[PDB]
Amino acid sequence: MLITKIVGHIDDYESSDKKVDWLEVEWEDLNKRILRKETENGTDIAIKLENSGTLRYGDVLYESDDTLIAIRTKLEKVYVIKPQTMQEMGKMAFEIGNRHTMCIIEDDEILVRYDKTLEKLIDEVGVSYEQSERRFKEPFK
Amino acid sequence: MLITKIVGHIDDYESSDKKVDWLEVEWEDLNKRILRKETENGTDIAIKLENSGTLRYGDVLYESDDTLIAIRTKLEKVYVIKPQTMQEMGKMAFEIGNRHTMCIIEDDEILVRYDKTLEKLIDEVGVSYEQSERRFKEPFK
Ligand code: NI
Ligand SMILES: [Zn+2]
Numbered sequence: 001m002l003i004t005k006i007v008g009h010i011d012d013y014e015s016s017d018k019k020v021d022w023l024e025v026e027w028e029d030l031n032k033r034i035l036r037k038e039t040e041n042g043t044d045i046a047i048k049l050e051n052s053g054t055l056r057y058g059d060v061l062y063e064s065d066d067t068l069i070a071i072r073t074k075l076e077k078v079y080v081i082k083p084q085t086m087q088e089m090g091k092m093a094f095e096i097g098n099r100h101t102m103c104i105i106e107d108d109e110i111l112v113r114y115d116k117t118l119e120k121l122i123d124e125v126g127v128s129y130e131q132s133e134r135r136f137k138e139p140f141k
Numbered sequence: 142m143l144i145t146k147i148v149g150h151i152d153d154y155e156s157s158d159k160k161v162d163w164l165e166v167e168w169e170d171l172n173k174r175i176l177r178k179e180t181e182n183g184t185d186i187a188i189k190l191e192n193s194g195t196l197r198y199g200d201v202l203y204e205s206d207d208t209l210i211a212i213r214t215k216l217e218k219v220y221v222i223k224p225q226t227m228q229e230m231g232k233m234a235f236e237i238g239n240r241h242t243m244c245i246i247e248d249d250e251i252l253v254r255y256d257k258t259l260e261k262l263i264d265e266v267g268v269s270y271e272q273s274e275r276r277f278k279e280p281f282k
Contacts, residue, residue: 086230086249093231094246097238105235108227 001043001062001069004050008060010070018068023061027073027102027113030055030139039069057137073135077114081122081129092125102140111136142184142203145191149201151211161209164202168214168243171196171280180210198278214276218255222263222270233268243281252277 010020021041029035031054035047045061055071062069083089093110096103101118104111112118114131122129151161162182170176172195176188186202196212203210224230233251237244242259245252252275253259263270 083227083231086224086227087246089227089231090224090234090246090251093234094238094244097235098241100239103235105228105231110231 001045003045003047003061006049006053006055006059006061007063010058010060010068013060013068016068018063018066021067021069023069023071024074025055025071027136027140030057030073030136043069045069056139057135073137075133075135078132078134079112079114079119079122079129080132081110081112081127083108083110083127088125088127092122092127095121095125104136104138104140142186144186144188144202146194147190147196147200147202148204149209151199151201151209151213154201154209157209159204159207159209161211164210164212165215166196166212168217168277168281171198171214171277184210186210197280198276214278216274216276219273219275220253220255220259220263220270221273221275222251222253222268224249224251224268229266229268233263233266236262236266245277245279245281 021039021043023037023039023045025035025037033049033054035055036045038044047055047061057072058070060068060070081092083092089108093105096110096112099121101112111134162180162184164178164180164186166176166178174190174195176196177186179185188196188202190196198212198214200212201209202212222233224233230249234246237251237253240262242253255272
């Protein structure tokens with residue numbers, strides 16, 4: 001199926017009886033215009049967005065009488081880094097920046113992909129972190 | 142005069158009546174082992190530290206009956222970036238690290254060299270800053 005435009009937002013279908021076939025994408029895929037990937041049900045999707053438009057989490061790509069195809073990012077292992085002080089947030093984020101590692105910084109936390117080599121740097125900086133799962137919902141960037 | 146060992150720490154001399162003759166160095170001179178420069182009073186200093194020694198801010202190189210020669214870095218034009226939230230500290234430090242800009246992060250402040258091209262970036266993150274004159278006191282590792 002070639003997809004040239006986004007046709008809705010998956011939250012708007014909360015009471016719909018239509019079944020969702022999820023197209024699961026990488027964090028990198030957020031805000032792309034061109035993407036080729038297969039859905040959880042095996043439907044081949046070629047996204048070639050005709051607007052200067054770009055993909056977001058929870059966009060609906062296709063609506064039939066009974067089915068919705070909608071985007072979400074994959075559920076993946078993360079570290080939630082929890083600096084306690086401003087100096088801590090600064091040194092940690094600097095070292096992440098310097099490494100060119102993708103992250104999301106919201107309030108007093110830094111979210112990064114699980115990675116054992118980075119875990120060793122988190123320890124040099126000396127910040128507490130917790131390991132968890134998330135679907136990345138915002139583009140980087 | 143040849144210096145092959147450091148003889149003290151300038152902060153320990155608070156009570157002293159001796160005059161300090163500062164040897165002013167560049168930020169990049171810290172942790173060097175060899176350097177030759179004149180003091181603010183015109184004394185030629187030839188540092189060649191003996192056994193893997195390295196220079197630090199505040200090192201006393203020479204003490205006479207009336208004088209202390211000590212290292213400090215030059216006063217130079219800086220931005221002092223004054224992030225008001227954890228989120229501000231983390232975003233700003235990430236962006237500095239990502240560009241590989243030398244900085245010192247101490248408590249709630251990021252100190253960088255005066256550099257007009259950075260104002261666009263600081264503005265983009267949205268963080269208060271003031272332009273000022275400071276000495277950089279730690280080597281950039
Ligand atoms: Ni680089
Ligand atoms: Zn909606």
